[PDB]
Amino acid sequence: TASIAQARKLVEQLKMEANIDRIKVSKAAADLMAYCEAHAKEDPLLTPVPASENPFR
Amino acid sequence: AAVERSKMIDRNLREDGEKARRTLRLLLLGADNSGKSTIVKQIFETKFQVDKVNFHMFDVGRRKWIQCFNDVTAIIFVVDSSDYNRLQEALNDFKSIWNNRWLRTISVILFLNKQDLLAEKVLASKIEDYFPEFARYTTEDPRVTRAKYFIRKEFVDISTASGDGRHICYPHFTCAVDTENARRIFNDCKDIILQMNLREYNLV
Amino acid sequence: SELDQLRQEAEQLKNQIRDARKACADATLSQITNNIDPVGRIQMRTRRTLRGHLAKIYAMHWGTDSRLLVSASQDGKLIIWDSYTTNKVHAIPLRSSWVMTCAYAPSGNYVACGGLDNICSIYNLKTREGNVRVSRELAGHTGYLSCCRFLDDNQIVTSSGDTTCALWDIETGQQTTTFTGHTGDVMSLSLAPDTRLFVSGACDASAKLWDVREGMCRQTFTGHESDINAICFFPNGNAFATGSDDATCRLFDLRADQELMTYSHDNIICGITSVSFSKSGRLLLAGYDDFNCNVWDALKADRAGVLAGHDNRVSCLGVTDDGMAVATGSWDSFLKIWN
Amino acid sequence: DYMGWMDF
Amino acid sequence: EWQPAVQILLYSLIFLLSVLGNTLVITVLIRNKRMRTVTNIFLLSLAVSDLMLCLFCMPFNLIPNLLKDFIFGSAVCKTTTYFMGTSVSVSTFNLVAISLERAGAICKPLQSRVWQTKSHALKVIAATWCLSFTIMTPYPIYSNLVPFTKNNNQTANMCRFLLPNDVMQQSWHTFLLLILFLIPGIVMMVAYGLISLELYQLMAKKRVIRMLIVIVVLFFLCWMPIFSANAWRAYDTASAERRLSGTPISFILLLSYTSSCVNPIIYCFMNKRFRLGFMATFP
């Protein structure tokens, strides 16, 4: 009867997964995009810094 | 003072690699009731010595972690030849190992253990009931020799269907009382290194 | 009849999940990011080469200060590097040479290492005797360890090949919480920036979101075709990226609960070994089996650069907390600092 | 007759 | 003037082919780090030494024969003689080193793992180069122009190398005939014979054994005539100079120079791995 208990466990897992709230993928993608342009200026990899600031010459 | 510390550390690592380079590393593979631990009389590991050459054998107590052993000298693969029910599983496992993406250049030393049990079973016959193609096979007891050669051929056909000469299989028939397995491994590793040298020195 | 009813209920629940995700999917990340300008070619160049390892490198981790880093190699040595001057600060001899992961404590006082020994070993870097010593050996996993990350000086999360993740209390040396639900071996791990959640990737092509305090699985993602090898949170903490043997990368969103974007090209046929994000999060850096490292525009999926220069498989990868430099390890036995 | 050569 | 026509034609042929081959080998070996093994270090050494031999021997050895006069200065005479001797010594010792490395790797594959390393190869290359530079010291000392007048009352010279006495001249030439021809020849024959014996005791194995035979045959045919002629001159200069002056010694020198032409061909251009590297490097 262990297989029955396992199947009940997956049933509960999928019930919990269905009970979660979700937001529109358009809004989520807009949020990640907005984060990216918000913190773009602080990223040295997408825009190299001059050798005066670069610690690795 | 820091750079001196770094240089001392680097000297220590160089001296460590010097000692590490002198051992040949071997991967032990096989299923249950194969008899892996009995092969050599001397992540588990074991060590033994033949003719001033150091061998260090490893067997993990399989797909993902096999990548760690893509640089060993040889893979030692053990198969139980006493019974025929598991022989198809052993052949499939051997094919999976031989055709592995990360093991394409590693030779396999094949051990077919409990040949005494196989001889007893044959002389005292059901192998045809598991392999219909064993019927009318040809080339100690002649029937036992026929069965041994049939099983060895079954492994060697898989071993030769692919490989392109990058690596080859070395089948052996061994028993529990056979103590020559270390010497066989030593000779096989000598052959593997010789074949590597022929390519690496532009001779072949 | 109970088992059949449970199976039918599971199928109905999975169909409802799929329908909820389909209703959620009103637009595509590629359509949203159509108007943004591309980053252009990412011309990164090697700046340091860290020599001293005499075998394949499997793992590296940056320190909280962007100077020090630790790397693990199957020569049996764990080396702490001063990346500014390439000096070797420490060289830790390991009890087992088959290691596969390494972590550097956020405080800087400890490092962790593990592999085919089914043990996570903690090393004290700030002892009073001047040498490095083991603090505790965390035993209890039944498979090999594939990733580990410190939460603090006393809390560390590990993933294992035994399909389970664990949370540890280092002082006691016992598992505080066990995480279960994966069916394939867990290969990667990534703590959230707020350290309240983490995601893991498994060989069953699935990614799960876990709750550290509760110990329960929140979400499950299954877009990949083959085993997932690498995982890493987006800097915002609301998304993550995975790399698979199927030779693709996917970006998922936690609040959207589904795939957002895939990073693939027809020429690439090898699997991804490691992934990481930059400071801004717009660049996604992935290591491949083709000996190269490719830079992906995580918002546009366009390939922006290549970190060529390694002569063997790129096993590891890591970006600094400041975002100044990237370190890549390889089976060539050399680590390289880029940009 | 510029006889002889250089050794090599 | 058919004989001079053939002489300069062949000089140009072997010169161009050896230069191009050595340059290609040097470029491929220096570019593909993957193609950097113990034997490949010695191959690069041999390519550099063959280029040195070609450049410092062949153009300076046809002129004094065509114009019967040494036109260059004493500095050029001394430098060219030193470089020719150095290149010959380095080439011969690199060949012996390659033969010994191969013999060890094929005869004791596991025992030779201890010492067949890149650092050991670097030690060997450095020792060979330094030993050659040290031993070839007397040539820039005793190389000087000997003047003579021609029938047209014109000036002329003979860059030449003469020790103060004929006895020590003979000793020097015997020492060269030993160390640059005889001992290396016996060592290479023994090494490749052992390699062939071990490898034989299949169509590919016969090919590689015949290649090992070709190596020794080419070495002996290329280097026997010139050393024999030098020994003949040391023992009785008059007869040797009368017989071999002009085209015969020029052609013997060309036969000697052909070793630098053939060595890249046998050692690299017949290797599949190398050919692949060349195709990957050049368009």
Numbering used by the authors:
A (entry chain G): 6 to 62
B (entry chain A): 18 to 59, 207 to 225, 231 to 254, 265 to 303, 306 to 320, 330 to 394
C (entry chain B): 2 to 340
D (entry chain P): 1 to 8
E (entry chain R): 38 to 238, 305 to 386
Please, what does the article write about this entry?
Type 1 cholecystokinin receptor (CCK1R) agonist actions are affected by increased membrane cholesterol, enhancing ligand binding and reducing calcium signaling, while agonist actions of the closely related CCK2R are not.
Under these conditions, there were no substantial structural differences between these constructs and when compared with WT CCK1R (approximately 0.7 Å Cα RMSD for receptor residues for both CCK1R(Y140A) and CCK1R(sterol 7M) compared to CCK1R), other than the presence of the specific mutant residues that could underlie the observed functional dissimilarities. At the CCK1R, photoaffinity cross-linking of a CCK-8 analogue with a photoactive residue at the C terminus (residue 33 of CCK(1–33)) indicated that this residue has a predominantly superficial orientation sitting at the surface of the lipid bilayer adjacent to TM1, whereas mutagenesis data also support a deeper pose, similar to that proposed for CCK2R.
